[PDB]
Amino acid sequence: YSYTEKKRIRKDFGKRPQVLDVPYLLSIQLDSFQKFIEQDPEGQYGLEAAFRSVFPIQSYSGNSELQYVSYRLGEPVFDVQECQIRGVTYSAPLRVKLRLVIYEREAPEGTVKDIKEQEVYMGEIPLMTDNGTFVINGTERVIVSQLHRSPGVFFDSDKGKTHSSGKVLYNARIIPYRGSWLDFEFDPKDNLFVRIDRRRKLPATIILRALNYTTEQILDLFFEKVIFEIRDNKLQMELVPERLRGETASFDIEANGKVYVEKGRRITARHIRQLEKDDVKLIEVPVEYIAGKVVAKDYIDESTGELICAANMELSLDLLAKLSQSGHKRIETLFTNDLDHGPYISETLRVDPTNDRLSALVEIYRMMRPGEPPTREAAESLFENLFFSEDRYDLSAVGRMKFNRSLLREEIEGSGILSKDDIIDVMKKLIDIRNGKGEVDDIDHLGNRRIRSVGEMAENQFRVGLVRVERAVKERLSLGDLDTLMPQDMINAKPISAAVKEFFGSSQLSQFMDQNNPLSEITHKRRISALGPGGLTRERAGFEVRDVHPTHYGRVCPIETPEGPNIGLINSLSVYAQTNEYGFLETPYRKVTDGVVTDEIHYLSAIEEGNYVIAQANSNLDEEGHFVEDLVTCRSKGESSLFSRDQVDYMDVSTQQVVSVGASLIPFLEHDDANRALMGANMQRQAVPTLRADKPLVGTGMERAVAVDSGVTAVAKRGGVVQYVDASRIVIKVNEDEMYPGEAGIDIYNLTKYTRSNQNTCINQMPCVSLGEPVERGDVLADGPSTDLGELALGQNMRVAFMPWNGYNFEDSILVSERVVQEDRFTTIHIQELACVSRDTKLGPEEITADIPNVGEAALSKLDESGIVYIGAEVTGGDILVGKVTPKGETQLTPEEKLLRAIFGEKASDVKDSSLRVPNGVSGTVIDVQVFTRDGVEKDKRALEIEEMQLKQAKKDLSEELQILEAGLFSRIRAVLVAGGVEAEKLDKLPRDRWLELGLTDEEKQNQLEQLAEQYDELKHEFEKKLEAKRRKITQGDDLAPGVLKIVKVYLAVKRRIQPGDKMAGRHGNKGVISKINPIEDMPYDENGTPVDIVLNPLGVPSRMNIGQILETHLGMAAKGIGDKINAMLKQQQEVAKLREFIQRAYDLGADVRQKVDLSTFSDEEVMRLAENLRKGMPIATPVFDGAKEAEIKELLKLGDLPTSGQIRLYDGRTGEQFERPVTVGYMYMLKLNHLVDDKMHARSTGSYSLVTQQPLGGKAQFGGQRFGEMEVWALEAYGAAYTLQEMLTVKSDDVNGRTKMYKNIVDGNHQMEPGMPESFNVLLKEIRSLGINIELEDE
Template sequence: MAYSYFEKKRIRKDFGKSVQVMEYPFLLSIQLDSFRKFIDTDPTGETGLEAAFRSIFPIKAYSGSSELQYVSYRLGEPLFDVKECQIRGVTYSAPLRVKLRLVVYDKEAAAGTVKDIKEQEVYMGEIPLMTDNGTFVINGTERVIVSQLHRSPGVFFDHDKGKTHSSGKVLYNARVIPYRGSWLDFEFDPKDNLFVRIDRRRKLPASIILRALEYSTEEILAMFYDTTDYTIKGDKLIMDLIPERLRGETAIFDISIKKGEVLVESGRRITARHIRALSKAKLEKLEVPADYIVGRVLSKAYIDKSTGEVIAEANAIITLELLAELSQAGHKVLSTLYMNEFDVGSYMSDTLRVDSSTNKLEALVEVYRMMRPGEPPTKDAAEGLFSNLFFASERYDLSTVGRMKFNRRVGNADDVGTGILSKEDIISVMKTLIGIRDGKGEVDDIDHLGNRRIRSVGEMAENQFRVGLVRVERAVRERLSLGDLDAIMPQDLINAKPISAAVKEFFGSSQLSQFMDQNNPLSEVTHKRRISALGPGGLTRERAGFEVRDVHPTHYGRVCPIETPEGPNIGLINSLSCYARTNDFGFLETPYRKVIDGLVTDEIDYLSAIEEGNFVIAQANAERNDSNKLVQDLVNCRHRNEFILKASAEVQYMDVSPQQIISVAASLIPFLEHDDANRALMGSNMQRQAVPTLRVDKPLVGTGMEKVVAVDSGVTAVAKRGGVVSYVDASRIVVKVNENEMHAGEAGIDIYNLTKYTRSNQNTCINQRPVCRMGEPVVRGDVLADGPSTDMGELALGQNMRIAFMPWNGYNFEDSMLLSERVAIEDRFTTIHIQELTCIARDTKLGSEEITADIPNVGESALSKLDEAGVVYIGAEVNGGDILVGKVTPKGETQLTPEEKLLRAIFGEKAADVKDSSLRVPNSVKGTIIDVQIFTRDGVEKDARAVEIEQMQLKEVKKDLGDELSILEDGIYARTKKLLLSAGLNESDLTSMSRDKWLTQNLADEGQQAELEQIAEQFDNIKEDFDKKFEVKRRKITQGDDLQPGVLKIVKVYLAVKRHIQPGDKMAGRHGNKGVISNVVPVEDMPYDQFGVPVDIVLNPLGVPSRMNIGQILETHLGMACRGIGEKINRMLEAQQEIHKLRNFIQEVYNVGESRQVVDVASFSDDEVLRLAGNLRAGLPIATPAFDGAAEKEIKELFVLADMPQSGQFVLTDGRTGREFERPVTVGYMYMLKLNHLVDDKMHARSTGSYSLVTQQPLGGKAQFGGQRFGEMEVWALEAYGAAYTLQEMLTVKSDDVNGRTKMYKNLVDGDHRMEPGIPESFNVLLKEIRSLGINIELDKD
């Protein structure tokens, strides 16, 4: 492959063998595409806002005299951009304007005659917009809407696994689940009667639904059963014979084919052989004894023709008496239902007998009573309720997905249809359920991904928006019916509040709208690709069983089997696999390569879980020859969710990549195939907790996925178009665009403003650093600036550490790790955390709070870091307890003493009584102030500091816009100069005149003149545009802020804290090997090798075998080889060896192994080779993709190239004694992460503080400044020691003996160290509790 200038700077050697036929799809597309569908106008009206409007409008008046019609909608421009929204704490949203048409019909004229039409654009609230990175800014914080995996609408057949009834009988059921509307359940009871439930209410016989649909008993029986006719001849019966129907019966009479030839003797079972003989004999009638018909069921009613009296109802069971009656009444042919005990059960027939209703009205009343118990039913109400349940599109919708799933399941050929149920739909569900009960067909697997679909942002927002519209609809309809529509405009009918409220509620407080995990770029990407089975309409943690959580065969390539949380959510929250996407119906699809007659093509098809089961699919690593033909005769395949061996000619598809089954986080673990799944799960989860370090360091051993994550996450600045870097500083990059990528008549300059030292949701630091230099060429997609945790466009979550697996004086007992002091000194794991502290001045009942430096009872030293406005300086270094913003609050008037009254009378009004309510630095925090923002309410005077900040911001904006303008000007003048020179003017003419006049020249050539005029016009537009931009920015900065009611001023102070690594911090590798730092040891005491190089971390070797994560050992070895090669290249550079030797060595390194990567170092220029070698000094970066990584042989080859022992083990010397350890130790480089579980955040000590109200014991937890609980077990320990006095003070004065502790505090102040324990408050609580049980206990104090 051809590498760009930037990519040649550092090439990661790839050990992957299987050729990549497709790039990784954009990782955030699940979020962006879904929201785009919601926002964009859909001409078909099936998705998004358009669908919501069309489903509610037109809104007709109850009388039908007028209606409000929907025409179109548009989204306006957002008021603030994303950054401004975050600073101001507002929502990033755009106003929704809808064009509505009010049509008033003429009552006097013919129906449909229009009297008046009014059209108007109506404001319908704000719609939050998605940022380019797939997030929403809601009230200033970035949030993510997690996609939900819920049960697809449609019909599902299931059974209770024999758990409901004591006999263990399996009871089958069917459930019709709509997208919205009532659920319809059919179920069998232990007696095999079929019942129906609506919305899980009381059950009714299933035939009630059919009767309510106007079916009679005879029609119901005809739908479910075939009939057998018997003709009465004297005292004999002649049966119409269909031989197949006799299967499995026991003959109660001899069956003869011909006279004297008995085929089946009485008492024998009729078998398939007998049936074949009967069919061969072509017998159409069979004489049967009268007993044979007894117990059978009549298919229709029989009437005595002479009297009109009903002799037998349909569904009556025949007895000998009834038979005689029917025969006497002259009925010669009796039609009975064909039923047997094997495959045609009598369920519907039995159910009809249980059913008490006989006609439609009775059935409707029964349904009404069940749905609305206690209400008196009327005919209209009952009919209205029933038709609204399943047959009204406003109340019931299967959705396109539901209809497709429904039709496929019940065997309808069509995939399309209406969203409501029809009579035929209900009957087909019952027939399918009875078929399953009869042994025809299988029940559904609800955990199959063909039965679960993804609901993404767009769909959920649309549903919520529709909820808001429904609320508005009622109000509009009532308003339309009030009459007097002449003076009314559409604007007067619509109240946008309910719509805004519904949308705001969803984005602000829905269970699936989550505070974005912004620890590092990986955690952002993973959060956006998360799929949750929880949330509204989903499962609950408590009720979710093992099956739902388990990995299902259909997860293959769709949902990651590894990445899921530990704990109560395991298996309910999953992550999307690397290549997966959702289809139009919301089902997950994964790509496969087509295989034709054993030949693997590059054609790619996306298959859903439903389609996949029908195909034979080979694995990505199936052996192929050079012409891409499958080599082996038998190939390991998947078919119908089973792993089987199939002939290569039968293979229809093949996986696209070995990484297809895992998620992004899991695919970042090298040698994943050598780790136990439990540890891989921890590894994937812990990478998301890694804190971005101050100095980034790319992993030596990676997987090749690092670049994809870094670019797709949006934390890096990526070139939109190719060109040359014309300017770079810490906060801005300017690229002059290539001619061939420019649009006609534009300046051809791209400006990238970088994010500097801003706070993330998790208080980590977001900062971008340029990685390009002036004059360097860039192509589209090149990384221009690194973000947090990225190194030259690759994800870099941690640091490469030299580690040794060995015990060291017990300091690495139980997963602890020993750290060298050098790591701390070199700031390898130093991280910056930014905290936002807010001070709010409110208007109180007693007067308004004031932000000031004049604070009562505070010394000068405490105010030393504040300016005259009472706000801390930027750059001030502050400690716990320091004042950041001085604020005073009015105090209630206190009762004055006589002396005060006298003083007040003499000296006049005393300064108003105020109390200090300043914002202080939290305890145990120490840092530097990096920014201050002040927001003042409209109409409140701005203080000096606010004005100063405002001036500074205006100055920055002016400078930024001025710089941009001058860059664009330079670009335009450069193009103009080129044009004028080509038109015949010479260089000296141009330099002699001012640049402004260049644009007013007259050129002979018309085409050139037109181009010059176009440039001049464009220049004017750019200037005008910049004036507008500056004006907009100026207005935003100078105008007052829209604050919450009662808030006068908000001061936000940003505090940067530098955290060094120290004992107690949690660290981890990428293989689930986590631990806590137990000690930081001086470098000279650490074990060192024969070259005197000490190790950085000592890990416990016992942490490997039982955990079965061998990947970490392979990573350590490979890391050592990479480092060795880097050191070798470094030695060559320092010795200034000939460039061809360096080139040959680098080529040799890249040629190791049989990988898919081709790096032709010979084609690089000498400068490029030196630049590459310079970047390889710290070690050769390597990609070993999951399931396709480096083999042992290849690691050994690298060891040979690095001149190192192939065992990867070295003899180490003890740094303290100078003695060699007795056996060689595995030493190498492992990528270690510092996790966001820092000891500084957890460590806390209490001296005095607040107490719990009831027990009077100290509160618990750091947030409440609480104490450690001396619990039951600790008491036992002191009892065991016999430390009576210690125990006594622990349970009294140090805890909840109120008087004792107050007295002791006084004594200590007085220098008296005695203590007198009293009665602990918990004893009083116990007394009160016993009294609440009605037992009076009184303490005798004598």
């Protein structure tokens, strides 16, 4: 077992052996962005693809072109941490080698007239942190993946558009990655159409007329030929038997002197085999039968040279006679069956008014650019640039792949330009689907939906920037000078940087990280949205998109999704899901060969899945790997049934493969309704990290992964033995073999103490190791905000009893004891930021100073000399935090103030106070002050003090850094030197720098000694050089906004405690607003006088069907029960052997549990440490759909000598008499949500008023008033209360004279209203009057 696991082993009730360990949970973000950067040599991705896509740029003439060579990412100015403090994007410079070649236009290709190579700077690109995030403007943002319609061709068909017709009508759509959509469709009269750029409908064949296709070629392409021979007697027709399906004989078919089909009957399939066996070639056809058929090609009068019958025209008797007259002895017609080969292209050609290529191009032009008189070259260029230009059209690799998949073509790759073959094939397959062979595609299928991650949208935005650049580069290359133009001259970083900086900071998909919890982070990074650019809209989204789809199984979670207006659009990646090289989700499966369930794992997409038959993870297996049941439950073609054991192709990997990471942490998920599982998964994210983190007694074994893979903890980079643990750093001395040859082998982790999160919570880290104890690679060295020894811990477990209590648990209310508030176990720290900016006004600079007018020494007691609070000062609402006073000018006062100031002789100062003070209702402890000053403004005294302290601590930190590293290095030197010459007196008494030139026997000893002499050289160079670098960074100025002289940021730290109103919840979707903090002596108490921490309603469970919370409760009471046994063994100081026996008995308990832990291999110290960690209750793992069963729960309850019914006799706390019938009591894990009533309570009597409408709207301290909407106006109209309404319209909101007059009346003690007319009404009158419409008020 692992070191961090040998100290607290969670008992696992899983039964199915796990065969694939969960992947790194953030690989989507990391892999995507690493594609976006890392230099692709060949298979263009990311920056290389964008450059090769735009460059080279040829000038409009061809005299010169701008050429691309390579790119390189410079080092970021400041690290992630420095950017957080300074508030600046964590980016890296992009530096692109470029070449300007200039050709001579006299000589043919006189290339060497000018060659000009120069590295140019274009844009900065933000970099991803090691945890899948970006530090943009100091705030940590996440860009969520996108699920969009994969590029390619989609055949759809709407049913009942013309509802009177009730006729399904089809359409095909070509959606390129970049470019113009192309939409073929039918219409109720079976007429094909093309809708370019959602413009007007055009007869579809017109597009073919734009591609050099004459009517003969069109009909040669789309139809099938029927041959007529005028064989000297009445229209002998060559017959192909297979064309004779499903027809009626309107004349008697006779060949070889034999009548096969009798006239008047239906042609039958027996007749067709008759004709095939008889090998009939030719049948006589009557001349009246041809009056309906249509001629294929265009037949001329070859006797004279004139035309007879135009192509695609219906033959008649006279036309047939004329054709026979002119020596035409072979005739072609079109096979137009009403069943299988409809006359679609023929009818469309017939309704098409165009007759040649130019007229079709002109029609295209007039549809695309209506009003503009088209020309030859304009029309030709427009149509060619539509689809056949590589710049304005890209189907992309995925697009060409999906296109050929929906065209059954063989080659995966191709070209991003539409061909003629492609439009022809799309038309042909749409015609097929109209006929009946093949069928439409469904859009919700996850083989037609694709994931665009951060690397790919970033690449797209970078390419858009490069286009913006190439415009002006072409403009400058065509006209401007040549020999005096370096490439650096003609590039502008602004257009490129603006594009990338708009995506990373202002995109809909680029959004503030949810940092309420380690789970909330790690599930914001696995989100998958269907909004933003190229996505849907929450109000124009349908129903088919929202509902689950059978292909979501293993790719997207069915449970976790917001339950507001974003119900189905936003959803979370499943646990084991991945993305193909084309962006399609895929899920692992064990291959099955010969019944045996193999160990090798194939990732199947959503399309290569369907045709296989996939067994389930619940299906039992034997040692060999064979199934046990004969009829294994499997699913195939998107639907499930029972199959044989040898008919099975694949198996699922784990029973948690269908759920996401947040729903994988709910225990007993299978016992809860999916409505409550949805709510539980959603609320589990908002849990606030409490003061002390406590493991869940019942978890699902997935907590360790969510904690270690969030990067909220400090995992060891390499093994070794801890050298120095501190509250704020862990120095670990690496093992010998894990140590690279040249370096000291000391890893230093600087834990991040109390730091604001995005949500004003506390990101704190606490070492969980002890000095001088071994550690291995991957071992958690420091807990995070909401972890506990490496396991996630979003909330705390406490004694819940399910029973009503005097109406204090009515309708989801929670009755919480007071022993829960005394123990400060749901107390949360809330760090807050307050900022005061000193600005240059037109009346002069504003000053931050202690001397504040109209304020006594009372308030100024806490400010230091420069006017900034001390660190540690416990402030309360209203206390001054920094003293800022602005220049003030002539204040027009009233004669009475004139008299007042001229009597007491007190003229107010010319300086107004705008000092920053704590917002009302807030207490706290100033824990940090940061001062930012321009580069050019003198630093006040406290800025200098802060600068000195930070400089000194930084210098000391670097000194300790190098001191520890070189101490370990001198240890390495001594260790190598005890080999090959051990010296006692001379070797130690020398200062350790006495090896810079001294030499000993030539082995690896002196080799390392010379290595470390060079290390002396360049590491002194390092020490002083980069120490001066940090000194410069510390003392350098700041790029503040224009007009800002200095900014002071003060960091309170509130400590919020439970109170009535704070929403709590559990993992099973059972919310609750705490109703009463009940005294300890009143809680229902057990038979041993131990009271009950929380009392929950039993009427919440039945109609909600979250039975899990019951089972969990029972299991919790089992787990804690075991702890008590162990507690009574450690408090009675019983031998390690007695504890080992009992603990071992407590692990090997389940039916046939997967886990087996053998305590014979633990040393007695390890057993005692494990027992110390279990004495608060033995934690238990209950995997999601492989849980623990009531048989095992009750064996556990019997192990801890508890009531196997899981339900005890509670006595009342107040009257002391037993509750009549037993109550269920056990430890349920509760979470304090983010809905703290401190933040939700708000009130207002009077305050700010908006500017235009003159109606309540504050927000800074006192927020805007309560909106009294239309529905409430209806309610008051219903009551008949006209006066309450009138005051809520005029004097409470808009009536200015009214509002102030009535404040005066209230203060006088007279409650009366003098209402006028609201401001918004006569604002409306002005706005209507400004439309030239004379609206007035007909006075009396």
